[PDB]
Amino acid sequence: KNKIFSLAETNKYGMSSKPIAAAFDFTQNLLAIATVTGEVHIYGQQQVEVVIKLEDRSAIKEMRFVKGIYLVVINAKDTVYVLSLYSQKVLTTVFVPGKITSIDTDASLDWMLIGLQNGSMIVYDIDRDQLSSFKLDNLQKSSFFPAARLSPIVSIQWNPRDIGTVLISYEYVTLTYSLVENEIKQSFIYELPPFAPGGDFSEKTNEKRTPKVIQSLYHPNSLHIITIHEDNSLVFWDANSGHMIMARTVFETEINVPQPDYIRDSSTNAAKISKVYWMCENNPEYTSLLISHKSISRGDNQSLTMIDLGYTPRYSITSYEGMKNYYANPKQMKIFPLPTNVPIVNILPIPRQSPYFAGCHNPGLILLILGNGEIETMLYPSGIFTDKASLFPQNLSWLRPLATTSMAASVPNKLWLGALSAAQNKDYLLKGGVRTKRQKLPAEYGTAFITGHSNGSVRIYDASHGDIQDNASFEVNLSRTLNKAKELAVDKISFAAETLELAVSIETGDVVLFKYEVNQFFRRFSLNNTNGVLVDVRDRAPTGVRQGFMPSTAVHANKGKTSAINNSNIGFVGIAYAAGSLMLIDRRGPAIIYMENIREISGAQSACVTCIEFVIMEYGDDGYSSILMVCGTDMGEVITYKILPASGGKFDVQLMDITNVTSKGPIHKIDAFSKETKSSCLATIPKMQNLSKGLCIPGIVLITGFDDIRLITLGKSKSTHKGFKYPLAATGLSYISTVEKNNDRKNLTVIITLEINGHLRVFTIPDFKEQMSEHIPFPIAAKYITESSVLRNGDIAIRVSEFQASLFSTVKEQDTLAPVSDTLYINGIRIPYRPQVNSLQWARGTVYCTPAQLNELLGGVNRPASKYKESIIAE
Ligand code: NA
Ligand SMILES: [Zn+2]
Structure with missing residues (x-):
């Protein structure tokens, strides 16, 4: 009554459910956190917070902020959504023709690179909602290992200082690719001779090995690259010559050298590497690596490791041995004990200097989402949790x-x-x-x-x-x-x-x-x-x-x-x-x-x-x-x-x-x-x-x-x-x-x-x-x-x-x-200029490409005007 x-x-x-993934946009200075049931929370200053619920109740795998006005969300069903931070609604839904195994975007670009299970790479025009005609076949099968199992693309990354070059890893080979010249620029295949110890989880040290690649990354200067593998090997290469500078793990070097009388001197049971992040300070000349480990047993076996590489020697006047010396004797290495034994599910650095260098430009804080839903925050590089x-x-x-x-x-x-x-x-x-x-x-x-x-x-x-x-x-x-x-x-x-x-x-x-x-x-x-x-x-x-x-x-x-x-x-x-x-x-x-x-x-x-x-x-x-x-x-x-x-x-x-x-x-x-x-x-x-x-x-x-x-x-x-x-x-x-x-x-x-x-x-x-x-x-x-x-x-x-x-x-x-x-989107905020190849570091060799020219390469000379009001606003 x-x-x-x-x-x-x-x-x-x-939150109405467990947080599972996060993202941050430098320019607009906003934080987005998605849940297991398809909800996206976007936070700003004070108590600013907007929640956008996706039609599908599927969990979110990855998010990226682009052009400062779009939020790209990908759920477990490989469905790509594009959200407007201006109108706070979904602009489009796209079902991807294949299984997504890797992606990469750039705050200043309209394009998203997409790697597939079949090893192909397609490109999506976020701003105009259209797939590009640009497509790459499985390069590993066609140019390096024809007889090997069909490899998916393990990771993709835009070259930090050249939007026209991309780093692509397959399971057994990594390579740099020029979208402008439409060809493979350099490749890198990590092979261990018999008796080479290899990584902490290396098996059958007696035979020859080509340990699978799990991730690839560009050194901030863009002249070196690192490849991480299943055995926990960290391999550094000269991006142009293809010369392998040095192979090491967190505790030892010369792991590529055969040593038949090798004996693992470690009172610490190895932890498989989960993910790696190459950070750099306010000044890009200084950098560091942040490494996470997948646990064994179930007790706090999830600590973070940091390797401060310090000042990067000038490329043009440093021999390979100089570089090897640089990588073998880090400025400092400290382990960051996690407060909990709960496995980490997502790691997000919070950039302070700019949106570039893959979003790792001088982060003073690192956001961590754990498997139980807790969210942790660790100050960087101090490692102090708050x-x-x-x-x-x-x-x-x-x-x-x-x-x-x-x-x-x-x-x-x-x-x-x-x-x-x-x-x-x-x-x-x-x-x-x-x-x-x-x-x-x-x-x-x-x-x-x-x-x-x-x-x-x-x-x-x-x-x-x-x-x-x-x-x-x-x-x-x-x-x-x-x-x-x-x-x-x-x-x-x-x-x-x-x-x-x-x-x-x-x-x-x-x-x-x-x-x-x-x-x-x-x-x-x-x-x-x-x-x-x-x-x-x-x-x-x-x-x-x-x-x-x-x-x-x-x-x-x-x-x-x-x-x-x-x-x-x-x-x-x-x-x-x-x-x-x-x-x-x-x-x-x-x-x-x-x-x-x-x-x-x-x-x-x-x-x-x-x-x-x-x-x-x-x-x-x-x-x-x-x-x-x-x-x-x-x-x-x-x-x-x-x-x-x-x-x-x-x-x-x-x-x-x-x-x-x-x-x-x-x-x-x-x-x-x-x-x-x-x-x-x-x-x-x-x-x-x-x-x-x-x-x-x-x-x-x-x-x-x-x-x-x-x-x-x-x-x-x-x-x-x-x-x-x-x-x-x-x-x-x-x-x-x-x-x-x-x-x-x-x-x-x-x-x-x-x-x-x-x-x-x-x-x-x-x-x-x-x-x-x-x-x-x-x-x-x-x-x-x-x-x-x-x-x-x-x-x-x-x-x-x-x-x-x-x-x-x-x-x-x-x-x-x-x-x-x-209100999320603020007008007039200027997105800074992307880092360019230092003519002082590696004079020549590069091919300058402006975004306008990249847009023509991937979108075609008759690229249509987008249907979004957001496209023109974001300029
Ligand atoms: Na209140
Ligand atoms: Zn009832």
Whole structure:
């Protein structure tokens, strides 16, 4: 009933599925990340983010930004899509005649080279949506190995300084090809004589070998090239003479020389090479190689290796031996240990100097997408990994690193907005696009989101995209507060919205308290230093932050993991431990005012308290309101405590009673409302101050069990209950206002419920008359569904999966403005001049070719004008 309620999704957070591939455009300075189900997220400065969903739900293999206005996306079905960063829609879909095994594009060119399984190479005109007549047959079969198996094209790359030359690798031969002269310029075939050790994974060292090629790359100067093979061999060649300069691996050289008495001196089990990147610094004369390794076993066997080659000797005055010396004695080699044992699925360097040199021009950061969906960021060349949420839009923080817990709360905008105004994100990395202003009409309450991570970090921000809320956020790190590096996974979180206080529990059982406030402005700190349970960590506050969530106390009970926590809005914090202990702390102090193991009080077989809540209402029938701490146990028991203002501003704790309320344990949600006004009875400072008035407010407490809800009156026996067909995921009370008369404001208190399978319901209380019944529109993960939070205005924040959350509204009538999108493409940004062959490095030998001339070669003299408005715009 009630035309008042209607289910609608208001917002999405994180990603609807696992990230699988990424790309970056230097010119527009935008980051694109694609998922396993065909969605493409494009990010820019601050919170700029646009999502484009492909018709096909197939996974994305590769993406490239071209001409600064197009995004080329290729899915698993070898279907090529071309997206417009100008109109934010798909411009064309193309099915490729064959299996795509390699490609290459260039930010300044309209052409994409495509290698196929059959070893052929075709060229596609991205700008005019047409295939070129230019096609290459399998050169390996026709010119080098006719009797060999039909080889596919393993890799293709545009010559860094000459758009008219391309580097092509087949399995057993690599070669440079001139599109202008239409002929093979040079070839390179890596052969090992008998007794040559070869790469770490080389087999039958006794015979002659031609180890398959897995990748080919041009040296930034374009005069040398490297070929990497299956045995892990790294071979450097002079691109013009074809002379093989030197063959080596990460640990040795002269691997091409026969050594019948060779013995592998390695205390490190080899890791097969996955991919290689040739980087260069601001000044192209300095370069380095970044190498990734496919794991063996399954334990952190995925580290990155960097070989800094330093200054490249001048080509014209360096002998082959000089060059061999250059490659044999790197300026430096360092291994970058990956924080995780999870396999890397995609590596993307983030260029800082220009879009050239295959997008590796002075990258100060490397983006990594892991098989589990986590996204890592490693500073280059330092190798320092960072999880600073502030570096990218907040929606990406759900991935860096994955959230282990989360919640949402209705917070009063009064002080909330003041805190956000002073917390704008001023140090994000991306610069592209413009965030479209989406001003949200004022409200007394806003929505705060809070996430915990395996990292030990906790992110805090507003779920809205308003002027002040959109780009504001806070991040607190327990690794600092605790001077710890392992065992930091956030287990539970409690956020007191009225006093902006925070309680964080970690996997060890320790709990740290924080509070939004002004800040005070050793390396030996350890919780085990003192014998006290309350450890002062006030001085462990973040250095340069004038204000924010500052730490105060660390709770070191040494009582195991927590079973429940609740930072009240009245200075008290309740903490329960799986082992049975129950603790009550008064922030005024701070001090522990109560601590007993509830197992010695249970009438049932209660092992621990599974839920804690603070209320101010009449206990039983004593005629006045009291401060009551209500606790639900894993066995359906409810324990009620009275918190009484005592002498010297302290408080006494009095156990009122323990009652076995339901066989549907455990109790995981507690709430309350007044019997007459049906307004919230959760404890608040103003309510606490009113105690001196001696008012009496009888109320009803809601006890949420496994699959049943109990309505009870504290201190009384009578009650009611409502059972559900499916287990309950989350419940909560909502307070709504409905106009109807002439300007009459009639409020309504409803309870909203979410079952673990995704079904959502709204009921009026205490009669429990259903007002709405609908299922969430998509599959939801049982694992995270229980983190969901019902909000004060009828909204509900739901965690759908490991990387996704959605905000839903249940109240139909709402002040909704038509959806709007951010701007991605910015006009007038000039794409720099591509590097050219240094007449100073290799004078002559090259054949200058302008893009105009390349366009004629590949497109023909009568190349049509494109049908895209984007073609002319991009000039
Ligand atoms: Na926001
Ligand atoms: Zn349903």
